[PDB]
Design an enzyme around this catalytic site. Structure first.
Site, PDB file in Angstrom:
ATOM      1  N   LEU A  14       0.844  -1.169   0.000  1.00 22.95           N
ATOM      2  CA  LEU A  14       0.000   0.000   0.000  1.00 22.95           C
ATOM      3  C   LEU A  14       0.888   1.230   0.000  1.00 22.95           C
ATOM      4  CD1 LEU A  14      -2.223  -1.499   2.750  1.00 22.95           C
ATOM      5  CD2 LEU A  14      -3.083  -1.060   0.510  1.00 22.95           C
ATOM      6  N   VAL A  16       5.050   3.013   1.639  1.00 22.72           N
ATOM      7  CA  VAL A  16       6.337   2.840   2.311  1.00 22.72           C
ATOM      8  C   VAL A  16       6.475   3.640   3.604  1.00 22.72           C
ATOM      9  CG1 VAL A  16       8.328   1.729   1.261  1.00 22.72           C
ATOM     10  CG2 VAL A  16       7.217   3.646   0.051  1.00 22.72           C
ATOM     11  N   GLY A  17       5.406   4.330   4.011  1.00 19.05           N
ATOM     12  CA  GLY A  17       5.270   5.073   5.268  1.00 19.05           C
ATOM     13  C   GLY A  17       6.459   5.672   5.992  1.00 19.05           C
ATOM     14  N   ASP A 131       2.870  15.713  11.157  1.00 19.04           N
ATOM     15  CA  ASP A 131       2.760  14.997   9.858  1.00 19.04           C
ATOM     16  C   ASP A 131       1.278  14.784   9.430  1.00 19.04           C
ATOM     17  OD1 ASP A 131       4.066  13.626   7.549  1.00 19.04           O
ATOM     18  OD2 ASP A 131       4.116  11.704   8.652  1.00 19.04           O
TER      19      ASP A 131
HETATM   20 CL    CL Z   1       4.486   5.939   0.521  1.00 13.21          CL
END
Ligand code: CL
Ligand code: AMP
Ligand code: 32H
Ligand code: CL
Ligand code: CL
Ligand code: CL
Ligand code: CL
Lengths: 362, 158, 267
Positions: A14, A16-17, A131
């Site tokens: 989904l 790469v956070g 964030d």
């Molecule tokens: Cl991402």
């Protein structure tokens, strides 16, 4: 055979956070879908973020708010840690606003309310998700907001400010882009303010390719209000996008605001600080020690302007601790701040301070 | 459960281990990551990789050289590794700043005289004082007991 | 009613955010009373820096005791008050007969709080956390009977110290001392009561800095600024008391019913 965790077969990445890879998880028998954050134990120690994750899990594991992504369970393995969390089909609010235009006043508001309810829930639990951006705001099938990347978040401790200059520079507050100290919630309000603008306009209030002029405009608090914008929401954006944190809108001021209050669902909701001196900041720090040792009190120099000192009590025979921080006020003045440390405590703290003050500068 | 991850390329990558009677189980590819997750009884287990015709171990991972020159990887699966907070626990082994304006905001100066506004969590435990108005020093700080707050004012001579 | 106080913790009555003034026993006793006035507080804990513990509570009564003990005249200053420390006077006040610090904890029940006010013949009790040592807040009769009224959803049947209009302050202060009474009803030409001079009224001397003249009448003193009958119900007596935020209610005086007395009945 496909890779399982829980009884979830791991699917497509989904994203790469913050710290690790996020993949889908479809349940073996039910078909239930989860989002899985894969944290390598060895990677999370290379960046010394182990403490951060320990805490993130700690908070996220108890939060239960409808517009915040639920942390279903944390599966630990010898090599990696898995964060099983609720999956939302609609994806990024960012891409929503990309594909579709800006949202209409009615729809924009609905989402801003939901987002703010979540932001409010965090702060109510001492968590400040730095964030906050339409890239971290996810949507479900029924168009509900879901606050998602707590990697950059932090705790709010009594007596302390945060420093970490974190998040995208467009959504980042002036005091963040300026790298100054902050309480925390006010940086989330400024981020929610830019989110609101994005929802209503489909553009960023503060945006430039010339990074220096983007950073200026952010500290200049200046952004453009298009003709379609409602003066009542304009007043609101003006209050949230204040460069002065002391002049910036609060989650209460927002709740109280008339544009916000509208159609809002029910379920959603002269003294002196320390002694100020003028010597060179390194002379003042020398001045403090040729006074602390003079009182025979054990310490630990953290930073060149931060000291964690302890005093040995002769009567009760119990150690009492206090931390000392030196800030700057003017172009011409500095200020020594005294903060109490938790293990009469309070009276002993004032006593510990006072002795030091009589042998010190203004 | 345990994570067996091969890193690097390959058309076909298989995990053969003691736990599966050295049978060749295939690993699922991400990009350059080939993984199989499987629970195995906490203790000792040896494994190896069958990556595109060649049998290799994972050089980075702990090995064990046998009496017959057999070099297989090894895995000592702990109880500490399975419980999250115990695992994170074992895993964890200039110029002056500008004064934030939040600190200049007092609850004393800004009904009942023994009642004050609820404070910003940030200006708790900080020492505040009044100018020494002839031999007497006034010190003050706000702290929190349970879900309630107390601003203690000390009148001390010098 | 009695069971109610045996349950709820002292902490429940502690306010959300409050002020607390503590004087070091080494502070000059004049500055001490003057500070109470400026901080809008009727009582303050006393910390002994040498003993490293709260040794007592400075109150308005302490001012009445000092004033009466050393009032020479309106002609000559109370040198004593003007230059004694809190420690020097607490030595004098409590010579061979000494009284330690009486207090309660947040966790302890409200019954333990009312019984301690009576059992120790006091009006103000400090709630102190033992895990810290920190004094949190001074609990009072009026504060307790306030919350005891925020829950409720004959006087003669259930069942004196006076001063005249002419009576000077000194004399009244003397009565407060040798009687151990909070307020003093004021009698006119006849046995008809016109006013009441309380311990509280005595701090207006400290406030206006007029303590060096106690030769002035109780009325002249009261110039800087309520009763009941016996055929009235005890609940109506309670309702009227708090609605006016007072400590006691008494056209001729027969008896005075106080907050400390109602609390003795509901215990
Ligand atoms: Cl991402
Ligand atoms: N003026 C007064 N004359 C006589 N007894 C009083 C007077 N004021 C209070 N008391 C008594 O003193 C005790 C404590 O009351 P108080 O000091 O008014 O809170 C009770 O037993 C009261 O009846
Ligand atoms: N980058 C990366 C990265 C990973 O992809 C993984 C994986 C993984 C790999 C392929 C599939 Br299909 C599913 C999961 C595991 Br299991 S642990 C891990 N650690 C990492 O750092
Ligand atoms: Cl699917
Ligand atoms: Cl969904
Ligand atoms: Cl956008
Ligand atoms: Cl490898």
């Amino acid at each position: 055979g496909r890779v399982k965790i829980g009884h979830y077969i791991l699917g497509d990445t989904l994203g790469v956070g913050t710290f690790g890879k996020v993949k889908v998880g479809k349940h073996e028998l039910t078909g239930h879908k989860v989002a899985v954050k894969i944290l390598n134990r060895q990677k999370i120690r290379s960046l010394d973020v182990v403490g951060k994750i320990r805490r993130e899990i700690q908070n996220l594991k108890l939060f239960r708010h409808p517009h915040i992504i639920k942390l279903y369970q944390v599966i630990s393995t010898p090599s990696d840690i898995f964060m099983v969390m609720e999956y939302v089909s609609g994806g990024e609010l960012f891409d929503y606003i990309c594909k579709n235009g800006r949202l209409d006043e009615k729809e924009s508001r609905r989402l801003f309310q939901q987002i703010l309810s979540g932001v409010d829930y965090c702060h109510r639990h001492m968590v400040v998700h730095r964030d906050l951006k339409p890239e971290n705001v996810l949507l479900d099938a029924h168009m509900n907001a879901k606050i998602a990347d707590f990697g950059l978040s932090n705790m709010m401790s009594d007596g302390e400010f945060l420093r970490t200059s974190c998040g995208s520079p467009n959504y980042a507050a002036p005091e963040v882009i300026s790298g100054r100290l902050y309480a925390g919630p006010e940086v989330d309000i400024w981020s929610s303010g830019v989110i609101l603008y994005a929802l209503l306009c489909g553009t960023l209030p503060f945006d430039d390719d010339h990074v220096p002029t983007l950073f200026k405009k952010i500290c200049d608090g200046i952004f453009y209000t298009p003709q379609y914008l409602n003066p009542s929401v304009i007043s609101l954006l003006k209050h949230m996008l204040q460069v002065d944190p002391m002049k910036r809108a609060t989650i209460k001021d927002i709740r109280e605001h008339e544009w916000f209050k509208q159609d809002l669902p029910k379920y959603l909701f002269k003294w002196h600080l320390g002694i100020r001196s003028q010597s060179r900041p390194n002379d003042i720090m020398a001045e403090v020690c040729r006074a602390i040792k003079q009182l025979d009190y054990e310490w630990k120099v953290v930073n060149p302007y931060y000291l964690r000192v302890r005093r040995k009590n002769p009567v009760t025979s119990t150690f009492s601790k206090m931390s000392l921080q030196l800030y700057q006020v003017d172009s011409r003045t500095y200020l020594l701040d005294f903060r109490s440390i938790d293990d009469s405590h309070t009276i002993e703290f004032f006593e510990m301070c006072a002795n030091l003050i009589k042998i010190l500068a203004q | 459960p345990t994570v067996f991850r091969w890193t690097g390329g390959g058309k076909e990558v298989y995990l053969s281990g003691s736990f599966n009677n050295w049978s060749k189980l295939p690993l699922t590819r991400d990009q350059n990551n080939f993984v199989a997750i499987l629970d195995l009884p906490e203790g000792e287990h040896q494994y190896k990789f069958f990556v595109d015709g060649q049998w290799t171990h994972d050089p980075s991972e702990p090995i064990v050289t046998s009496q017959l020159g057999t070099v297989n990887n090894i895995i000592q699966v702990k109880k500490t590794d399975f419980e999250v907070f115990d695992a994170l626990m074992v895993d964890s082994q200039k110029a002056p700043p500008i004064l934030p304006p939040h600190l200049l905001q007092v609850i004393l100066n800004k009904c009942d005289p023994a009642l004050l506004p609820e404070p910003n969590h940030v200006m708790l435990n900080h020492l505040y004082a009044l100018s020494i108005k002839d031999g007497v020093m006034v010190l003050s700080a706000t702290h929190r007991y349970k879900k309630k707050y107390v601003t203690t004012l000390l009148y001390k001579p010098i | 009613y009695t069971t109610f106080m045996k349950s709820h913790r002292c902490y429940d009555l502690i306010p959300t955010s409050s002020k607390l003034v503590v004087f070091d026993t080494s502070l000059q006793v004049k500055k001490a009373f003057f500070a109470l006035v400026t901080n809008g507080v009727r009582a303050a804990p006393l910390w002994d820096s040498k003993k490293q513990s709260f040794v007592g509570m400075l109150t308005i009564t302490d001012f009445i005791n000092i004033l009466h003990r050393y009032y020479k005249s309106a002609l000559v200053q109370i040198y004593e008050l003007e230059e004694h420390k809190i420690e020097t006077w607490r030595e004098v006040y409590l010579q061979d007969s000494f009284k330690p610090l009486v207090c309660i904890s947040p966790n302890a029940s409200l019954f333990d709080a009312v019984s301690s006010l009576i059992r120790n013949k006091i009006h103000r009790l400090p709630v102190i956390d033992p895990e810290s040592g920190n004094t949190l807040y001074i609990l009072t009769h009026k504060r307790i009977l306030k919350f005891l009224k925020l829950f409720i959803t004959s006087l003669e049947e259930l069942q004196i110290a006076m001063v005249r209009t002419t009576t000077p302050v000194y004399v009244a202060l003397g009565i407060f001392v040798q009687h151990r009474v909070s307020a003093l009803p004021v009698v006119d030409e006849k046995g008809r009561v016109v006013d009441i001079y309380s311990k509280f009224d005595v701090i207006n001397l400290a406030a206006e800095k007029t303590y060096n003249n106690l030769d002035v009448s109780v009325t002249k003193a009261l110039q800087h600024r309520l009763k009941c009958y016996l055929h009235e119900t005890l609940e109506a007596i309670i309702n009227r008391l708090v609605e006016a935020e007072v400590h006691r209610l008494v056209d001729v005086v027969k008896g005075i019913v106080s907050l400390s007395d109602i609390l003795q009945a509901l215990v």
